[PDB]
Amino acid sequence: PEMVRGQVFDVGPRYTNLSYIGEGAYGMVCSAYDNLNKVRVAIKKISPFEHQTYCQRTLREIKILLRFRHENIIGINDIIRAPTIEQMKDVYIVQDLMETDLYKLLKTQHLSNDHICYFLYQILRGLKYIHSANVLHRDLKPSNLLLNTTCDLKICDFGLARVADPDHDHTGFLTEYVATRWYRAPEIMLNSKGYTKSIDIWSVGCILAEMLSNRPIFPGKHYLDQLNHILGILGSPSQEDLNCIINLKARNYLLSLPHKNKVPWNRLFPNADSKALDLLDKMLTFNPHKRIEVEQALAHPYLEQYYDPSDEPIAEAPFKFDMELDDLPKEKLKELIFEETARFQPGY
Ligand SMILES: Nc1ncnc2c1ncn2[C@@H]1O[C@H](COP(=O)(O)OP(=O)(O)OP(=O)(O)O)[C@@H](O)[C@H]1O
Numbered sequence: 001p002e003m004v005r006g007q008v009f010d011v012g013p014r015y016t017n018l019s020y021i022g023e024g025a026y027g028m029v030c031s032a033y034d035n036l037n038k039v040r041v042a043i044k045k046i047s048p049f050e051h052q053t054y055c056q057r058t059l060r061e062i063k064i065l066l067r068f069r070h071e072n073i074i075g076i077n078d079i080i081r082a083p084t085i086e087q088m089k090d091v092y093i094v095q096d097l098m099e100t101d102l103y104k105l106l107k108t109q110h111l112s113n114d115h116i117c118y119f120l121y122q123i124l125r126g127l128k129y130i131h132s133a134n135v136l137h138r139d140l141k142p143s144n145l146l147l148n149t150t151c152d153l154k155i156c157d158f159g160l161a162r163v164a165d166p167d168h169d170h171t172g173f174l175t176e177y178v179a180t181r182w183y184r185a186p187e188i189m190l191n192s193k194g195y196t197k198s199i200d201i202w203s204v205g206c207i208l209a210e211m212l213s214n215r216p217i218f219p220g221k222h223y224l225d226q227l228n229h230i231l232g233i234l235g236s237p238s239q240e241d242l243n244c245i246i247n248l249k250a251r252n253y254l255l256s257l258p259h260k261n262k263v264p265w266n267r268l269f270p271n272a273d274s275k276a277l278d279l280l281d282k283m284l285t286f287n288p289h290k291r292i293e294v295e296q297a298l299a300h301p302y303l304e305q306y307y308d309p310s311d312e313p314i315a316e317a318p319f320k321f322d323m324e325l326d327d328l329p330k331e332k333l334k335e336l337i338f339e340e341t342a343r344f345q346p347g348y
């Protein structure tokens with residue numbers, strides 16, 4: 001069985017002449033040649049079975065990617081694992097090979113206004129499909145946007161995704177959270193569990209800001225510093241926005257801060273297109289109820305060259321309830337993984 005820089009990477013016979021691409025907390029990524037389809041592919045080795053949290057993440061991502069089918073969301077082409085639950089220790093997920101991700105591209109390339117427009121259009125086209133299936137991604141960020149050599153963009157990484165549950169979104173002040181700090185909406189820090197669609201629109205607004213300047217807009221170093229960063233640019237929230245925060249601890253914290261005025265986006269991004277800044281402002285709205293939703297953003301004048309709602313499809317089959325994964329022991333989650341991957345086994 002083939003090896004790759006340290007650990008075994010066992011995907012023959014079909015996938016051959018492999019090459020290292022990257023690591024994880026509990027897997028690794030290589031490219032490989034696909035002998036049936038005669039193309040190179042990406043293969044992610046996942047070893048999650050020792051750890052309940054990992055099993056959850058892996059199950060969630062497999063179940064979601066297998067039921068989604070959209071041009072701007074990464075598909076699973078194949079899944080390689082042992083034929084029995086006893087012998088299954090690792091799972092390999094085969095996907096289209098993407099040239100790069102938006103994080104890597106932005107460390108070295110300036111994007112033209114045309115590219116920023118086209119990438120934003122594709123991110124919102126894919127997000128329309130995701131929200132239409134009642135799913136929230138929760139971890140949108142440049143490293144989770146894959147790009148190929150012709151600038152097709154696919155959203156990936158649904159490890160933290162959840163079914164939307166707006167009725168149960170409210171929580172206390174400074175409650176712990178999982179997703180990537182620089183792209184987290186202000187309400188996550190204040191009074192939200194991140195169970196509504198508006199948290200993904202905030203992360204897209206942070207990604208747009210980062211495409212315009214090649215630097216994260218709110219690069220907080222930690223938890224309430226992230227909010228300081230936000231308020232330093234957006235200004236103090238209005239009375240109407242604070243009246244929407246009933247939790248006294250979060251309300252009082254905001255009232256304790258010195259007043260700050262808005263820094264105009266054109267002061268921050270003097271080369272940006274004025275239409276892009278108008279859309280940025282609407283995605284980076286403090287009040288999640290006033291923040292633009294995905295279909296409104298697709299309709300914004302900035303995207304008028306690409307906008308066509310008949311070519312912006314929605315899901316056939318929404319998730320009604322969350323995967324009951326809290327919750328399940330490792331052993332049950334391994335069995336659901338084995339079951340969800342069965343369709344890829346020889347014969348069948
Ligand atoms: N389909 C793919 N094609 C090419 N590279 C990929 C693909 N999926 C991931 N990668 C890359 O392989 C390396 C490690 O993968 P990465 O862990 O970032 O993927 P992910 O879906 O974001 O999962 P994770 O939850 O581990 O971040 C990174 O450099 C990443 O950009």
Ligand SMILES: [Mg+2]
Nearest residue numbers: 143144156157
């Ligand atoms: Mg990722």
Ligand SMILES: [Mg+2]
Nearest residue numbers: 071310311312
């Ligand atoms: Mg088309």
